């Protein structure tokens, strides 16, 4: 059976761009602390240069229907097309939202996309829609599907802007197809998994593998 995305799953929002007649895969990323705006980390050249995947991981905290979201705002579940999802940055724990500020010189109607400290408001919620009619509203979102995200607050698609030389992500009225590639679904207790930060101890010697202190003469 095809894998179905579920809440509490780490995912990376991925888009494809053609630069110099070459397909380039980019993942939505954000630092969170010191920079709330989202950029795009290329991942096609992974064999030669590792991507900074630490900041590209988002957790599907919660998925709701539109009416349920309206009621909740007024006051594991499989993702279904048409529902509203709440993406929380794994590192900073700030929620992906459609910012009111805009810095896109090319597009006047576009808005910046960035992280938000709190989940309050309708800016943090995004609605998934099928990219093609092969899927229909109410169908479970299969892993590897192409979907378009529409901001609830601004009614703007999550867009890849190639107008300028740089590739940038913004909320505009032009739609971009996004792939929600799973990173992890559920880790059984006590087992190591990729993307975990850990210390490598020398057996049980209490010795750990480490680089030299800061300002060392070996340049660390």
């Amino acid at each position: 059976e095809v894998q179905f995305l579920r809440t509490d799953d780490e995912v990376v929002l991925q888009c494809s761009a053609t630069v110099l007649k070459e397909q380039l895969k980019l993942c939505l990323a954000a630092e969170g602390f010191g920079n709330r705006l989202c950029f795009l980390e290329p991942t096609s050249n992974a064999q030669n240069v590792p991507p900074d995947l630490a900041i590209c991981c988002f957790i599907l905290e919660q998925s709701l229907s539109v009416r349920a979201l309206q009621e909740m705002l007024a006051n594991h579940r499989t993702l279904l097309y048409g529902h509203a999802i709440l993406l929380r940055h794994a590192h900073s724990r700030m929620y992906l939202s459609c910012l009111t500020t805009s810095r896109s010189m090319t597009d006047k109607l576009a808005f910046d996309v960035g992280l938000q400290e709190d989940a309050t408001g309708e800016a943090c919620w995004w609605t998934m829609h099928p990219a093609s009619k092969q899927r229909s509203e109410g169908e479970k979102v299969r892993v590897g599907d192409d979907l378009i995200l529409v901001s609830v607050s601004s009614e703007r698609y999550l867009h890849l802007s190639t107008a300028s030389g740089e590739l940038q992500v913004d909320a505009s009225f032009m739609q971009t197809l996004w792939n929600m590639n799973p990173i992890c679904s559920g880790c059984e207790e006590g087992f190591v998994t990729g993307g975990h930060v850990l210390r490598l101890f020398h057996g049980h010697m209490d010795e750990c593998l480490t680089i030299s202190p800061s300002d060392s003469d070996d340049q660390r």
């Binding site: 090319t106 597009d107 006047k108 009614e155 107008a163 505009s172 009225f173 032009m174």
Partner: protein
């Protein structure tokens, strides 16, 4: 085609605005459809250029 655009905009105005007050349902639907099809706003309001 500004002339046809104006005619259809006039019809949409009559559809949304009634007796000096806006009809909320029709206004919301019309706004959503217009934003979904940005070319309705005309070349000037088109975002990219």
């Amino acid at each position: 085609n500004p002339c046809g655009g104006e005619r259809y905009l006039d019809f949409l105005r009559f559809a949304v605005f009634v007796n000096g007050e806006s009809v909320e349902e029709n206004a919301n639907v019309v706004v959503r459809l217009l934003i979904r099809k940005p070319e309705c706003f005309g070349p000037a309001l088109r975002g990219e250029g």
